[PDB]
Ligand binder design. Structure first.
Ligand code: ZN
Ligand code: ZN
Lengths: 48, 114
């Protein structure tokens, strides 16, 4: 039956849309900003 | 706490008892020289070994291209805006990520911590 149906993998499976791309980029930016804030807290001796 | 040497053969002086005048003295083990002890303490160790690392920072590190430098913290003596910063930068330095600041100005080298 797989001869009739078919199965594959390609670029279109690994790609996503621009809304999801911008969401991912926003999450990465927020994470980097949080790490910068934690670094600032550590350097200012404000880390408990 | 310090080590003082003999003035005759330049060997190490050792503390010893003066049993009649009841005073600590330093005497050489290789001759007969004796010297009165002013500090009146011999051995001391700090187990927690807290030391200011600002004394261990050479002022030459302002010429390092690899160290980061900031503009927000100015120097205290010359008021120079640019200054490099770095961490404790040593092993057995307990747990602290405290920054040490060195002014990167010519004929300067004031060191402060925040
Ligand atoms: Zn001697
Ligand atoms: Zn300065």
């Amino acid at each position: 039956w797989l001869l009739i149906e078919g199965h594959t993998i390609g670029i279109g499976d690994s790609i996503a849309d621009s809304k999801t791309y911008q969401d991912i980029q926003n999450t990465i930016k927020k994470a980097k900003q949080d790490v910068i804030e934690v670094i600032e807290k550590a350097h200012n001796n404000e880390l408990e | 706490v310090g080590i003082r040497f003999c003035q005759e053969c330049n060997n190490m002086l050792y503390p010893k008892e003066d049993k009649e005048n009841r005073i600590l003295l330093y005497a050489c083990r290789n001759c007969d020289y004796q010297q009165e002890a002013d500090n009146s303490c011999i051995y001391v160790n700090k187990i927690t070994h807290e030391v200011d690392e600002l004394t261990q920072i050479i002022a030459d590190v302002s010429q390092d291209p690899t160290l980061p430098r900031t503009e927000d913290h100015p120097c205290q003596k010359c008021g120079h805006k640019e200054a490099v910063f770095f961490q404790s930068h040593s092993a057995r330095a307990e747990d602290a990520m405290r920054l040490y600041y060195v002014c990167t100005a010519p004929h300067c080298g004031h060191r402060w911590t925040e």
